[PDB]
């Protein structure tokens, strides 16, 4: 089941690297890595998201980047860090209202102005309060995506780590490399999140061909 897979992948998250300010984040593609049946993976993730255990957030760095976060890690980290760094500055109350009203209700990826203006009685001032909280970011005029405060650091590290790992596979012979060889290899300093994490992401997005050989699963770059 996808629920297990997200659990193990969430364990791989090096929380210390982000000083426990960011809740652990799992990319949907990595969920595809451990669960080859892509369709069943998506159905069960939708099941979980409806149940309210997890949230899905548009990370933006790629149009197909959806980060998966346990709802309770999201609430805990946002309340703690935001209210602490923002004790007194006004949007703390607005964010409290948001976490109390919207997140339990709708797990939807995007938020449109009409919903917050009417169903939730949020004002323009309060919406700007959230936007400065980091909790919303602009999709369009009057449209905003859910967001984790501080995600930029994780995004930058993930992007550089992914490209570094892909480069390491490229520079191996054939543009090929065995998975065990990669994992045992000393990680570059650019790769700050750990190699298993990035390897799952590459395999899941079909950026690297997984070839099951007698020596194990080989990584090969598909011919571009």
């Amino acid at each position: 089941s996808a629920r297990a897979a997200v659990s193990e992948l969430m364990q791989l998250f090096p929380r210390g690297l982000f000083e426990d300010a960011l809740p652990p984040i799992v990319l949907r593609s990595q969920v595809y890595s451990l669960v080859p049946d892509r369709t069943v993976a998506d159905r069960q993730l939708k099941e979980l998201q409806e149940q309210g255990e997890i949230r899905i957030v548009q990370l933006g760095f790629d149009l197909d980047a959806h980060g998966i976060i346990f709802t309770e890690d999201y609430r805990t980290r946002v309340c703690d860090c935001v209210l602490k760094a923002c004790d007194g500055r006004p949007y703390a109350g607005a964010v409290q209202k948001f976490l109390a009203s919207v997140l339990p209700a709708c797990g939807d990826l995007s938020f449109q102005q009409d919903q917050m203006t009417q169903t939730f009685g949020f004002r323009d001032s309060e919406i700007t309060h959230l936007v400065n909280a980091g909790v919303l970011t602009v999709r369009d005029a009057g449209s905003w995506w859910l967001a984790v405060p501080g995600a930029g650091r994780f995004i930058k590290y993930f992007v550089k780590g992914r490209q570094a790992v892909l480069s390491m596979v490229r520079k191996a012979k054939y543009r090929e490399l065995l998975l065990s060889e990669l994992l045992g290899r000393r990680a570059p300093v650019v790769v700050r999140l750990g190699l298993t994490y990035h390897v799952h992401d590459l395999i899941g997005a079909q950026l690297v061909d997984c070839i099951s050989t007698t020596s194990g699963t080989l990584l090969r770059l598909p011919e571009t």
């Binding site: 012979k173 090929e176 011919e223």
Partner: protein
């Protein structure tokens, strides 16, 4: 028994020899005749080497490929599978991916691959419809001079 194969192809390619060393060529022939997955491994070696940026290296790789093609049957299916990319890298049909230097090596590669394609069409063309299609496609869409 994979290390020795990579070694041997490495000497054959990186040497830049105008003509293949026949003794280690025969060693490669025998050792590849040993196994078919090993034949695919040699094929992968050749494909990897062909992408590398040097005309002489590509000439060596293409010559090895021609040897195996004329000598092996499964190799024929394996290469005509990706005949598209193979022609692209050898003929330089896509101008966006020209042939590396030196110019003499590039011209020799061009002549040799034209002749090899002609011979393959004569010999296995009926046996591999995709080869006949590729020949015709070269002859008209790209207008390759087969008489040069």
């Amino acid at each position: 028994m994979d290390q020795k194969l990579s070694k041997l192809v490495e000497e054959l390619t990186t040497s830049g020899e105008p003509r293949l060393n026949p003794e280690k060529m025969k060693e490669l022939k025998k050792i590849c005749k040993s196994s078919e997955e090993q034949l695919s491994r040699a094929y992968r070696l050749l494909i990897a080497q062909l992408t590398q940026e040097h005309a002489e290296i590509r000439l060596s790789a293409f010559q090895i490929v021609e040897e195996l093609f004329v000598r092996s049957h499964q190799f024929r299916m394996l290469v005509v599978s990706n005949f598209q990319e193979f022609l692209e890298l050898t003929l330089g049909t896509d101008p966006a991916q020209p042939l590396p230097p030196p110019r003499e090596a590039a011209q020799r590669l061009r002549q040799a691959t034209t002749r090899a394609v002609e011979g393959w069409n004569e010999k296995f063309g009926e046996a591999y419809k995709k080869l006949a299609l590729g020949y015709h496609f070269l002859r008209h869409n790209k207008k390759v001079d087969f008489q040069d």
